Amino acid sequence: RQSIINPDWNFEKMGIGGLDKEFSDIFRRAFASRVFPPEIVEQMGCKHVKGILLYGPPGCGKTLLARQIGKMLNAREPKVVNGPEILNKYVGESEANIRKLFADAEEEQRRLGANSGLHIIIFDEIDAICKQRGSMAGSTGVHDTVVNQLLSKIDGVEQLNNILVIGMTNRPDLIDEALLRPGRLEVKMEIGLPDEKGRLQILHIHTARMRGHQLLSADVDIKELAVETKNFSGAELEGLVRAAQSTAMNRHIKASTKVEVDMEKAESLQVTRGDFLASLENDIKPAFGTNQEDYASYIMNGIIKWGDPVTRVLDDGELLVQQTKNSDRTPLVSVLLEGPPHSGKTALAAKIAEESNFPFIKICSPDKMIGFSETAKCQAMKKIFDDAYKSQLSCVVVDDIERLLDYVPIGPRFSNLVLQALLVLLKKAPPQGRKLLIIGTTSRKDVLQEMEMLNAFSTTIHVPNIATGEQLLEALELLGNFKDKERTTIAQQVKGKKVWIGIKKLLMLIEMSLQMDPEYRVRKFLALLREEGASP
Template sequence: MSDAMELFREIPLRRGDRMGVPIVETVLPNEQERLQILSIHSDNMKENSFLCAEELRLEELASRTKNFNRAELEALVESAKQFAVIRSWQNFDSIKVTMNDFLEALDKVKPAFDDAISALELFRPNGMLDCGERHAHVLATVKTFAQKFKKSERTPLLTCLLEGPSGSGKTALAATIGIDSGFPFAKIVSAENMIDRSEYRKCALITKVFDDACKSPQSVIILDDIERLLGYLHIGSFSSMVLETIIHLLQRTPPQGSKLLVIGTSSITVEDLKLMKLLNAFNVHLNVPALSPTDMRQVLEPLDVFDSADINNAITALNAEIPIKRLLVMINMAQRGGKGAHMSKGHQKIQLSYFYKCLEMTNTFSNVS
């Protein structure tokens, strides 16, 4: 991980515009800097007797504006003033900006780098299920890396690849890590956002996400299903332009004052990842396995979809390790099976015979594909 331990580099100048003026990338202020900015503006209002200083909680405002840049903080202050004017329209001589005015302004003024937690939640619709010790180990390992990285003063970049069979829960793990990281900027890059895009356009979109992330003091980017981003069919068929762009961005040190955590997910075999020189582009790689019979029990028992006597038979029928996504698909099919489900102890239970039919159907689809 020596590459990840490099000292911060100075902020690079981007290519100037046509007038020859260099463009410098700005970094979002951290919480202490936001507190200083808000303090300056509140002091100005105090001097003009516009502020109800006794109830103003600047530390709370600084904490709740983690994705605001300087201009947006100024806009927040102006919006609070406007709410105070509207509230005091019958007596302008008594205008006082209160904490409530700032709280109302927070509902109106939104940062450009808005909170992306709700977007990440879409990638784990079932929440973070208990999938057994092996999945828990992967999750705990990356979370530990993320927290140490967050506190480190020497490491501006950390990259981690989650590899394993398709449907093994890699995206849900990555989304959970992104949500729990507490980083102000979080973005997931997926192929769904790049349908019918040219190679050049894909590269530009991916690069923009990384450039935007570098404007925040702490950011997490998830490169989901890297094989789909590459248009990967087999080792000789994929976009070399997109691959080179991703490798370059994974090795590009963020500017001073910015920390970037990148989590990739991929179902490409480790051997092919090595051949593509993609595996070595990540500091760490961890395998996310399919569910073992013990893991399946960990999933099925809390879901309470089988009678207790049927769980062993259901697991035996599966007869192999399977990805969590496939298990959930079969459960969903069996639950929607009409006469195939029944009520027991207040819960809808799955009839084992209908579960067997769903298993046969999914096996048929797997063989065809």
């Protein structure tokens, strides 16, 4: 008759946000048979579920779920196992430790029967003790003998109906297969990264005891925090709040002359938006995706509009991103950025990717794999691509294709494994209802044509060089060098012909010219430009 839920309970009390669906499913599949009137439940001949498994990347709220589940129930205190804490040196005592966890349940069932309370058991890092059988071929065979005892005790010749085991792991591909059949561990949830609304809920949970004491200034707005925080887990949001609080507190402490804390101004403590911004930009840093310090590294000197080609390229990129976002017949789209060397392909591709406001953005450059062999490169590319399949809509950049596969005109010599991996990965669509965009950059279009790699791409965009005196003058004017009269001379001897130079080389030539004494700078610049004279 006594209920199994505590008389005073409330979903808000526990303090977990962003996992409503997971909790609903857990409650439906686990605790639905323990709340209905006994008479109907006993008229169906159904056995209660006695197993749960939770897995996911670190910091997504698993141990919190287990702790709150344990606290919710109106049962005895759960028996927790802190990792591999059931191992002993003596022979046969490792199993005797894993067999003492079920004594009370068995005794109570044999005493009352069909009316006993629940016995909750919690396993932390189940992968520590329960692993594949036949692996870990070391010595003493203790590991293979504990899995057998656990399986035989979970369900065997003897019957138990007042137990429930919860497991948590980060590597669910190592657990034994006979421990996951329906009956041992039936419910297998999956805790993942939160969405924007989940981020808002998490932020509002951890900022509830401060607003209630006028400790938080009204200047702060939570929508901005939820927007800027991308690829953030609950732990990282809590860490950000903690860092903001710490930097707010530190202003009232004087160091370098012993530790002295002012007790007069301490009654006017406040938390400002500046503290939050500084903490965001200094200490806290996520570890899933790409960060601003990478765009700041690829787009070094910004973008300057010296001609309409830049606008044309940017508009084409905008159209492609819109198509992939809205379209549903084509979940996979590709594009190739081609042109002469020193044109500005990588910066333009990075800018196009940045201006898309996608959740997941990544850049796969060849300078992070110096000295790698073929297998290492293939594994790295596969790992980078796999994460993009676990999001909602993502973009990926593959710059300098000719370096990913080691091309050299002599021979020619290159890598076939990487070429085939690329040719296969460019035509494989992501799971149902998910969308991907790929932007590849190169400088040798004919070679790609000879490899039958130019039809795997959906389209192509051309990035040209500076090819007129007016464009050169505009670039010089925008850069901010050779001004007033010094400019006029350059115009006199340049407008009467054509030029062929990239943008990177232009900066290099300007820097080279500026090192001479003031008088011979224009002459040196003109001589350097005339040396770099060519055409298609």
